[PDB]
Amino acid sequence: NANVVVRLLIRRPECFGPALRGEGGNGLLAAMEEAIKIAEDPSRDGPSPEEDDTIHMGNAIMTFYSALIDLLGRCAPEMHLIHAGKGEAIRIRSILRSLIPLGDLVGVISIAFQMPTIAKDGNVVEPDMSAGFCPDHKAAMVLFLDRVYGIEVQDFLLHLLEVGFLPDLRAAASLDTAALSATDMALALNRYLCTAVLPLLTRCAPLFAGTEHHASLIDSLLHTVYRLSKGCSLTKAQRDSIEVCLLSICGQLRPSMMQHLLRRLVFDVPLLNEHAKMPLKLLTNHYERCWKYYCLPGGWGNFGAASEEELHLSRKLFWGIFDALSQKKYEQELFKLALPCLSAVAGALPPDYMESNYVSMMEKQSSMDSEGNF
């Protein structure tokens, strides 16, 4: 049913909309921008001479193009058939690639939303969902980009992460305030990120191996995802998806890159609240994998060794977790997940390690303060 539909749609190219007709069509990204302008303008948006009868034409165009792209992405052949080498599947994928350029998808993803804001009186002003650009529109873009073009290059992955994925994650992490948490924008953005973006980054985890040159974007991504995980309104499925994504990425990352995330973890884990569930496992996995980096003086030959600041952080984490467990009431799962982390940290730490009297200067934990995080 996919091969028939694709052939029918290419037989009648008018089905693709004026942007993609091809006789001087502006393009998908230009169509989305014109839709933004139309949805902003009152005259072209409305009839301009019961409330449900109001059709926001900008949103209508956006939804049409998003639905078309989603349908084509679903019509794209499955990966295993292409690996087997079926000529018809390869040809269908080639046709879809010809129809939709990758640059247009990247641009449409790069388009940013309009975030809700709180007013002078404290009543948050909310953009109407029935009008304007919605994350569901980008969901179809991501579906097409994953099922047709595919992300198999670290350079493409990093470029996408820098241009389109990271800004939305930052917006979600910034909309985690108490008043703005339950808003429609927040819920829609969480549903988009936890079902389209994060699973993509989880499936593309191996590409994260050789990212030494991009050592800042990875750290930004880790902190943003961790803040989103600490967010409150997230459902159980969304929380699980974030946990899986973070555990997958951190496992493939280099030992040195996780220093910044370790600095945040050593300040939140000792609380041993429910939110520490995922940090405990992340620490356990990290110190089980990269144990040679810490214990042996040589460490990993390619990776190197600790800077003794990581060692200080690790010892502080170990002792904080130990004390918190000591004065914490016995919880079954909490204890059976805290014990492996303590054991892994103890194994990783060199037995004869030097406690440096040179304490850090201006430890900026108050910078990421408990309330407001900044």
Added chain:
Amino acid sequence: EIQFLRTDDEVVLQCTATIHKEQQKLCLAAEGFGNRLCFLESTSNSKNVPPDLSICTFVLEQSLSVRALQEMLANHRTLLYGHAILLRHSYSGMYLCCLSTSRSSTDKLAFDVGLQEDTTGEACWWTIHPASKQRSEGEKVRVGDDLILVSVSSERYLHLSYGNGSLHVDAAFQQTLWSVAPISSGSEAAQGYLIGGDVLRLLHGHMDECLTVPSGEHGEEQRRTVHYEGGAVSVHARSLWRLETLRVAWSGSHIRWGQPFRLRHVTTGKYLSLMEDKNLLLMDKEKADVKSTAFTFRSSKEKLDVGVRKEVDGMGTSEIKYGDSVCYIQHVDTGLWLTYQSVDSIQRKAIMHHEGHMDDGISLSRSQHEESRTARVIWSTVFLFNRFIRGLDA
């Protein structure tokens, strides 16, 4: 009684243009060396500008079913609607294909149609479908049919692009009706007999002086005259002429006495013609008119007119034999006979006379395929390099 397109038949693909409310017949053309792209050659203005069918002719190698072609890719037949055909360009020996690289002729979806060397892949193969509801899948394809072609690789029709200022041929989702015209059939050809589109030498006299133009004096205006010369010029490429008939369809048939044709000088690309001052001078494709550039082969000097003969829609009967037959050239309109001025290698001038000498008969010698190919290569290369030199000089 009805003719079917068969494999190993040399044909051309035609399309109709409706620019500013007129019917303009166009043929698919491509030259192997240099530009691999495909362009359109006009055959509607045959009276004013001769068409270059030599780069428009194609040959049908194989006509396999879709199932058989898919099986093969996984690993004198008569064309039937729905089969996949392989077209080989006669001049270049390369096959029509979808290049998968677009020139961006205001159509992002469209692809470019060109020529490719290898046969492997699904780009070279094209499916033939009925363009008329009278025909149906599986039926034999008549010679006088409109055919719609779909690329196996991209499912894009062979499309004629009106939208751009110049006419283009491309692979697009819109469909354009193509008509296939039978140029010639290889099997019916008779050895030693002159057929249309042969590169040949016009040998004169016992000394076998061949009708040629002045040598490479670097003067494109001095090379425009015509004279009889003997010696190494009979082996050189400056004595090669291409005989082109005035008809598009069945242009590769057997040449008959009393059949008008145009003689084209291969290396210079200019057509033989008669001046108003009664002198033989080569002019250009743009100003080669039929009235000036039409010649005839006549068996004898007799003044009896050949009258009018019904043009047979077939290969015809063999009537002119290479070497054995002796022919006399006569201008179609003026009726004058080509002759030597006999004024003094030999370098005797070719003048165009009412009566002429008694020994004005010529002999016809066919040229090897390699030699003809090399001469056209020389012409196409000198054209491009002269353009390059002029641009650099500017």
